[PDB]
RNA sequence: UUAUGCUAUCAGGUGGAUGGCUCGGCUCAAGAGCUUAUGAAGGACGUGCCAAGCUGCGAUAAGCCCGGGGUAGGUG
RNA sequence: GAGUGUGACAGUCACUUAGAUGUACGCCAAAAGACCGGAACAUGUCCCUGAGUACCGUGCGUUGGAUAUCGUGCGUGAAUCUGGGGGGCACCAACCUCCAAAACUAAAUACUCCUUGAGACCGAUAGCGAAAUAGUAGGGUGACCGAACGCUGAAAAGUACCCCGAGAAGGGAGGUGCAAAGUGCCUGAAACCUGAUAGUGAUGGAACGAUACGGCAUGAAAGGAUCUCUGGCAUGAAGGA
RNA sequence: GGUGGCAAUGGCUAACCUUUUAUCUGGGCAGCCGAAGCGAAAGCAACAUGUGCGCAGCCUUUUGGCGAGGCACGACGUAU
């Protein structure tokens, strides 16, 4: 969150840079597919180790998979199948940013999750 | 001065990058001088030496405001139509203390009928207003 | 002389007087003071702090040493505090107590508004300056425009009137500037479309507000820079049947 | 009109001023009337020496129904007894008031030569 | 095959200018404005699994407890 | 439709924004109650109303304060409503004005460690000394003086395997990546240094060039195609065999 | 100085208020300058043109006339 308040890029850039991490944890959102949103009242939620996503820019697009991780300081994730191969030819993760990602399926194992979406 | 028309010139219109150097360079700081070397300077800018006359206090001395027979005739009847004189049957009554001048001088012609009440009056006004058919009332 | 009045479909439906700060004499270079007075008076304070380059004791090893006379730290050859030397102080900077505001009388001032107001009724002018419109100048709107609360309906007013022409070339010719405005805030040079005159605060205030290049404003917040952005006169406006009724004595 | 007069005409600011001196010099060219030429050069001398006449001037100088040009402004110091036209560059609203009152006209450069383009006539006032 | 050299260009090295970017600086405006013997500010020393500096912390030592917001990651 | 991030320029991808919500402890706070109490006049051989104080002499500082600023060292030193002080030298008189020598008292005002905002500000030799493991490294016994150093890439995908090499150096080969950009890695100028190419060169004279004419090399683009070369013909100023 | 606003019925506001975040719009006559000078002061206090020449411009018989501004007098206020 910043405020129109300070229309600066300083302060934008220093306000995301040195977000705090429960600021850092709404830096994952995503569009939600058509159906989530509609049967949500939201047009975006968090992104989450484990629920399905649809990459739909980079090198990736249309790919459907799990998170399969999260880092909140680098404002990452890690699908399942969103890899590079190194020169070993072992396969690594690409991570992605979550705004270039699509929510097709939510994981709902925790009761919060509901309200951590909305309200 | 223009620095962008001297950007190249070395030394900045100042003649010798000898010059400009500091109040040598002008004589002294300020009016400086006004005895032995800026005698003349000080005679052409009023600064010569020497002390004239006395002051009275600002307590007792007082100048006063003026205005013209001159003036009051040729604007009286403005000053009339924005209400401060009035025609007493051709008659112009002005006062001067809602005016604002405590002296009314007799500079120019009075053409009219023209009463008019101050604090003072030069003679050649009283004169001027008694042969233009008006009259001088002092401000008791 | 007289203006026609168009209604929200943009159909004349009567006439009105144009009061007399409509044929007011075209004084560009009035304009130009009266913009540059405004730009001037909104300028802001800067300059380095008090002893930038200063807070050194540096002083002169003075001759006998093959070095210049230039003042050097106590316990060091490295130069300090004079404007040539690396770290030193800036010669002749900004001053904050510097003063940029500046004065136009009011006489003047006013003069200079009725006549970027006269040089908005000129069509040839406005389209000089830059506008894409089609109506015919000076447009002049019934007073429901100005009771009309969402930027849809300011969008079918203009559509109507043949105006969104001038809007739309403004947002598609909004651009990120060259330079250092970018980082300093000012990454977009911004296009002036539309300039909508209201008679005292209404929604079409907040209407209108996020039109692109449209500025909509009230005869009391009405000025130079406003009337000729740049200092250029020719301003596409939308007159209200109130702010005409209202700019009778505005500025005489 | 040479490199003077084009720094003059360059250095003058007012759009009404600069199409003055151009028509101004145009019709003493078309006309073969010097007075419009003058007057275009009087213009494109400095504005710290425009002509400010006052109403007295007028009134001590002219006649009934005396035909005045002056290349500046009229202001309303003094009266004005008979009726007098006068094109001027621009006026005082007093001035304007007295000679509307005493019966002149206040025209101004443009329609006094609309009016008479020979220029037959005309005093010039400063 | 004229060496040692000279002049110009080209390729490369060194170097870190230029350009672009910048979480920094500076100035101005609006707020807000005391604290410590119930031991302050500041400093020393210690404190991390591998930890030397800074930062935080104080032998309960990059930390412990309670309530609220936040919710799936965290371990400056 | 302020802006920032997101693999290149984003109102509609994300955070936001406009606009609404909520908020513990606190802070202000109206209705309505409890409480000490306030204000006029008449009468007057009545009582009280600030002391080393006010004033003054003299010395000094300070002040625009001038014989007429304020301070305080020494000396001196009153009066009590029928009173006392002031009205820019002193005194006399008239008139006007006040009541000191005891005490408190919000607001309008100053400032910027700090918070927020903004900026015709600087953009890494600039801007704070410090874009900081910066009052640090370092210097001085000390008071104190005081630096330099930003940037791979979209993603480490940060080069597998092989050969040489004493090698956990390095090189070659081979890969990754749109691009090596190969870790003090964006761009990568000049000085300086290494090599190549063009010209010249061991009989040669020096402000390193300008101009004209030649040799050699080059002359793809951005320069010419009645343009370049070589001639003829017509007209040809000054001049003129 | 160049360019402008207004103009003797003159010009401009300062602080400050109005900001709806420094702009801006509208106020704000306190004050300053001009409007009468001379004189140390007390004090007193002047031409809305009496005359001549004359540029531009206009008229004209091309020689003259009128002639703003300008120039030269005359007159007057005050100090000595």
């Not at chain 2, 009339?80 to 049957?89: H, N, Q, R, S, Y």
């Not at chain 3, 075209?26 to 304070?45: C, T």
């Not at chain 3, 008090?50 to 006998?64: D, H, I, N, P, V």
């Not at chain 4, 151009?22 to 003058?38: F, H, M, Q, V, Y």
């Amino acid at each position: 969150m910043i405020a129109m308040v300070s229309k600066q890029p300083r302060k934008q850039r220093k306000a995301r840079y040195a977000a705090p991490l429960h600021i850092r944890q709404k830096f994952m959102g995503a569009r939600l597919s058509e159906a989530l949103t509609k049967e949500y009242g939201t047009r975006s939620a968090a992104v989450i180790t484990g629920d399905t996503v649809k990459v739909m820019r980079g090198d990736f697009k249309g790919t459907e998979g799990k998170v399969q991780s999260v880092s909140l300081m680098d404002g990452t994730i890690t699908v399942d199948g969103v890899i590079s191969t190194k020169v070993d030819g072992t396969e690594v993760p690409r991570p992605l940013n979550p705004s270039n990602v699509m929510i097709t399926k939510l994981e709902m194992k925790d009761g919060r999750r509901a309200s951590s979406i909305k309200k | 001065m223009d620095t962008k028309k001297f950007r190249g010139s070395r030394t900045c219109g100042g003649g010798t990058h000898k010059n400009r150097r500091g109040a040598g360079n002008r004589g002294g700081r300020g009016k400086a001088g006004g005895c032995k070397h800026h005698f003349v300077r000080a005679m052409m800018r009023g600064y010569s030496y020497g002390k004239h006359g006395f002051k009275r206090p600002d307590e007792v001395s007082r100048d006063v405001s003026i205005v013209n027979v001159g003036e009051l005739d040729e604007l009286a009847s403005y000053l009339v139509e924005e209400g401060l004189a009035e025609v007493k049957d051709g008659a112009y009554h002005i006062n001067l203390e809602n005016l604002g001048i405590e002296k009314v001088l007799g500079s120019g012609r009075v053409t009219k009928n023209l009463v008019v009440t101050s604090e003072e009056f030069s003679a050649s006004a009283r004169e001027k207003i008694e042969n233009a058919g008006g009259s001088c009332i002092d401000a008791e | 002389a007289t203006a026609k009045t168009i209604d929200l479909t943009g159909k004349a439906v009567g006439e009105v007087e144009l009061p007399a700060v409509f044929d007011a004499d075209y004084r560009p270079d009035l304009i130009k003071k009266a913009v540059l007075a405004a730009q001037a008076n909104r300028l802001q304070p800067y300059g380095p702090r008090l002893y930038s380059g200063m807070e050194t004791s540096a002083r002169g090893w003075g001759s006998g040493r093959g070095v210049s006379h230039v003042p050097r730290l106590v316990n060091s050859s490295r130069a300090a505090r004079v404007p040539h030397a690396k770290g030193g102080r800036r010669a002749h900077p900004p001053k904050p107590e510097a003063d940029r505001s500046e004065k136009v009388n009011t006489k003047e001032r006013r003069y200079a508004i009725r006549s970027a107001i006269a040089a908005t009724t000129d069509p040839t002018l406005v389209s000089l300056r830059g506008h894409i419109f089609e109506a015919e100048l000076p447009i002049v709107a019934v007073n429901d425009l100005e009771s009309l609360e969402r930027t849809k309906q300011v969008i079918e007013f203009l559509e109507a009137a043949g105006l969104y022409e001038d809007v739309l070339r403004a947002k598609y010719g909004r651009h990120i500037r060259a330079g250092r405005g970018k980082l300093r805030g000012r990454k977009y040079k911004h296009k002036k479309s539309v300039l909508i005159v209201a008679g005292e605060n209404t929604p079409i205030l907040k209407a209108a507000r996020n039109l692109s290049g449209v500025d909509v404003v009230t005869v009391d917040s009405l000025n130079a820079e406003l009337l000729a952005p740049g200092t250029h006169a020719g301003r596409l406006t939308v007159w209200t049947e109130s702010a005409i009724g209202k700019l009778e004595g505005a500025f005489q | 009109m040479g490199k003077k007069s084009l720094v003059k005409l360059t250095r003058k600011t007012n759009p009404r001023i600069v199409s003055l001196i151009l028509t101004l010099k145009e019709r003493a060219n078309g006309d073969s009337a010097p007075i419009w030429k003058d007057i275009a050069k009087r213009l494109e001398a400095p504005s710290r020496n425009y002509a400010a006449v006052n109403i007295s001037k007028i009134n001590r100088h002219t006649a009934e129904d005396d035909v005045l040009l002056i290349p500046g402004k009229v202001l309303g110091a003094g009266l004005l007894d008979h009726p007098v036209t006068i094109a001027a560059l621009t006026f005082s609203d007093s001035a304007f008031e007295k000679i509307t009152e005493a019966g002149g006209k206040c025209l101004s450069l443009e329609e006094i030569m609309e009016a008479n383009p020979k220029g037959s006539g005309i005093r010039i006032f400063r």
